[PDB]
């Protein structure tokens, strides 16, 4: 289309898509900056997933620790 051009939103995205292109079979334009970015990005995605699940479970767990020691003991306190 004068010319066939493709956009990526950022530069690490350019590096990740060009790395995926090189793995798929695109000719280049072992090694210096790769795959430090791949290792850090994979660990970064692991951080994201683990933080999501741990936030969900602590969000599920802290109502139990505010119910058991405060509300239930206050209930038995006002009871007897």
């Amino acid at each position: 289309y004068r010319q066939l051009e493709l956009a990526c939103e950022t530069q690490e995205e350019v590096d990740s898509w060009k790395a995926s292109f090189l793995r798929a079979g695109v000719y280049p334009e072992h090694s210096m900056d790769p795959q430090l970015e791949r290792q850090v990005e994979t660990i970064r995605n692991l951080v994201d997933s683990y933080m999501a699940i741990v936030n969900k479970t602590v969000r599920d767990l802290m109502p139990k620790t505010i119910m058991h020691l405060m509300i239930n003991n206050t209930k038995e306190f006002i009871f007897s």
Partner: peptide, 29 residues
């Protein structure tokens, strides 16, 4: 292997206009 939204810069009349498509990258296509 890798799918993701990526934008084409120059787009013909038959395709449409400026748009971010969903690219599906495979080891062959």
């Amino acid at each position: 292997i890798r799918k993701g939204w990526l934008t084409i810069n120059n787009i013909g009349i038959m395709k449409g206009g400026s748009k971010e498509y969903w690219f599906v990258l495979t080891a062959e296509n």
